[PDB]
Amino acid sequence: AHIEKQAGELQEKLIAVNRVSKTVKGGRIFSFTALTVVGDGNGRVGFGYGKAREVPAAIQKAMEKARRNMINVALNNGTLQHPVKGVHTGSRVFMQPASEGTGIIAGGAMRAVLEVAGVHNVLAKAYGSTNPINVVRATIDGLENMNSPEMVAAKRGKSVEEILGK
């Protein structure tokens, strides 16, 4: 029954909660749906939507789905090495290189999602849909446009990426 990935650190970021209705066909039951984010400290594509009778059983379901069919991904230093504009499904987010002298600057549940992602110093404005369910894809799409450091000279910088497989 599946392989799972782990981090040596705890994430229990509950982002949303909902309830399921059929309203006449068996009427309406007490069930909830839930969305929970499991990072790594440097990032994961870990996002899980699950559902059950009660809120606790529901979140723990959703926390399980945030670590199966998912793998961890990694980025050196608290910044991102590319000024790129991550888009995922109308929720569009921005990054530009920065200092360590600034840490996070963000609010709500977003400051908690960016800390595990490693893209919190580079944190620039979000636009399009910025309600909780889709705003939180920073650590997914913003780590699939990824750049990360491996060179010793800027003029060997494109040469060094070519010889990584040649």
The residues in 41-100 that bind other proteins, with binding defined as CB under 8 A, are 53-57
Q: Do the beta carbons of residue 124 and residue 95 sit within 8 Å?
A: yes
Q: Where in 14-33 is the site for other proteins (CB under 8 A)?
A: 30
**DSSP label of 32:** E
Q: Which does 88 bind (CB under 5 to 8 A by kind): RNA, other proteins, none?
A: RNA
Q: Which residues of 47-79 are buried (b: 16+ CB within 10 A; e: fewer)?
A: bbbbebeeeeebbebbbebbbeebebbebeebb
Which residue, 94, 91, 101, 99, is CA-closest to 124?
A: 94
Identify which of 67, 63, 44 has the alpha carbon closest to the alpha carbon of residue 118: 44
139 binds, among RNA, other proteins, none (CB under 5 to 8 A by kind): none
Size of the site for RNA (CB under 7 A): 72
DSSP assignment letter at 44 = B
Site string for RNA, 145-164 (x = CB under 7 A): --------------------
Interface residue with RNA, options 79, 80, 86, 92 (CB under 7 A): 92
Q: Is 165 in the site for RNA (CB under 7 A)?
A: no
- Site for RNA, residues 65 to 84, rule: CB under 7 A: 65-69
Q: Given the rule CB under 8 A, which residues bind other proteins?
A: 30, 53-57
